Amino acid sequence: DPSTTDSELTMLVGTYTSGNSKGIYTFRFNEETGESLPLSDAEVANPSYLIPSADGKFVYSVNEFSKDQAAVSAFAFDKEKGTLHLLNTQKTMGADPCYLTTNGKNIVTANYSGGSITVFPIGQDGALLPASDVIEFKGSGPDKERQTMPHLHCVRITPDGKYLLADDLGTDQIHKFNINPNANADNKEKFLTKGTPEAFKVAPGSGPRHLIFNSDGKFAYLINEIGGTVIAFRYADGMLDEIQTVAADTVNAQGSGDIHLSPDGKYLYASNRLKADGVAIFKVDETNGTLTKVGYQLTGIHPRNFIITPNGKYLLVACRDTNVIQIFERDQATGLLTDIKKDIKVDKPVCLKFVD
């Protein structure tokens, strides 16, 4: 059943709406040619991070606000039309939600300024129930301006479906929770409980930002915003064991951003902001999971988020300050990038996601 649509992905773009952005923008993106087409948009305030549901029928976005407007919005999504239809919104009761994840039964946010995480059950229609849990953290780190309190920046469900790991930029920790896979809107069971250990500690002043796992779930990789380092870990049965620390940033910019593995697992990419904005490229040793830097690609300004297409052919960079999504072709044998000069104009893009 080959179709033109096979290579056509639906892309969701989250933004900051302090300027001309309406909120969420949707596009068709061809992962074999790099061509794109605008589809629709949704008026949503500060949807700086969003996710599709696993079946692609729903989209959930944060509403990143410093006070009482902090929330999550739930939408019905039509992948073919690229249309978003708001279902409802619920308050996080934790300032600046900046990341979210789902297991199909609950949504979890990382509240940056609240220094907390919020759990929302998902109703039978895909809409959100009011928060069922708000988990507060305590502590600080050595950075005088950035680590005065916990700052939750990432929430990830482990590849074995058993744990939730939450990156805390403010305290140099990855908090660990046990997941109750049965917890849902109907039974009202608690989703998260503190695990053993309650947290993993990383080098002081690192500022843990985003965490990813490899395809078989035996390795994890963390990008540290302040330290500008990538930490490689061995992952097994709810344990993170540090195996290597490498420098993503080499100019002490203290603005590292996002992290992604190529789908074939052969290369790791990590972005840097503020100085020498771009993407560091590492070759992954497939057996021991360690990294060796192989290159660097300068990008537009403020690459807070990027994504790799499922076929591994393109790497798309959201450049918040240049108001563009830059498209790079990947050389699958060297990991190196080539700007194909097919930029997508978007005001303050900060989150890219695909729906197949």
- In the complex, the residues that contact Mg ion under the rule CB under 5 A are 205
**Maximum pairwise Cα distance, the chain:** 58
Q: 297 touches which of Mg ion, Na ion, none (CB within 5 to 8 A by kind)?
A: Na ion
Length of the chain: 356
Residue 35: enclosing H or E segment and its boundaries?
none
d(CA 257, CA 304): 5
228: number of Cβ within 10 Å: 25
d(CA 270, CA 231): 11
Q: How far is the CB of 297 from Na ion (least distance, A)?
A: 4
d(CA 59, CA 102): 11
Q: What radius of gyration, in Å, describes the C-alpha atoms of the chain?
A: 19
Binding mask 252-291 for Na ion (x = CB under 5 A): ----------------------------------------
Q: How far is the CB of 298 from Na ion (least distance, A)?
A: 8
Q: How far is the CB of 29 from Na ion (least distance, A)?
A: 20
Q: Terminus-to-terminus CA distance in the chain, angstroms?
A: 16
Residue 56 or 205 with smaller CB distance to Mg ion: 205
For residues 172 and 201, the answer to whether their CB atoms sit within 8 Å is yes
Residue 143 or 258 with smaller CB distance to Mg ion: 143
- Does 337 help bind Na ion (rule: CB under 5 A)? yes
Six token digits for residue 314: 């393109």
Pick from 147, 214, 297, 305: which binds Na ion (CB under 5 A)? 297
Q: How far is the CB of 334 from Na ion (least distance, A)?
A: 10
Residue 71 or 337 with smaller CB distance to Na ion: 337
For residues 29 and 6, the answer to whether their CB atoms sit within 8 Å is no
Q: How far is the CB of 275 from Mg ion (least distance, A)?
A: 15
Q: 183 touches which of Na ion, Mg ion, none (CB within 5 to 8 A by kind)?
A: none
Residue 337 or 355 with smaller CB distance to Na ion: 337
Q: 205 touches which of Na ion, Mg ion, none (CB within 5 to 8 A by kind)?
A: Mg ion
Residue 123 or 205 with smaller CB distance to Mg ion: 205
What sign has the CA pseudo-torsion 325, 257, 156, 146?
negative
For residues 172 and 166, the answer to whether their CB atoms sit within 8 Å is no
Q: How far is the CB of 339 from Na ion (least distance, A)?
A: 7
- If binding means CB under 5 A, how many residues of this protein chain bind Na ion? 2
Q: How far is the CB of 282 from Na ion (least distance, A)?
A: 14
Calculated CA dihedral for residues 333, 339, 344, 346, nearest 10 degrees: 100
Ramachandran region, residue 266 (left: φ > 0; alpha: ψ -120 to 50; beta: rest): alpha
Residue 143 or 277 with smaller CB distance to Mg ion: 143
Residue 275 has what DSSP assignment?
S
Q: 232 touches which of Mg ion, Na ion, none (CB within 5 to 8 A by kind)?
A: none
For residues 23 and 17, the answer to whether their CB atoms sit within 8 Å is yes
- Does 70 help bind Na ion (rule: CB under 5 A)? no
- Does 30 help bind Na ion (rule: CB under 5 A)? no
Residue 169 or 280 with smaller CB distance to Na ion: 280
Which residues of the chain form contacts with Na ion (CB under 5 A)? 297, 337
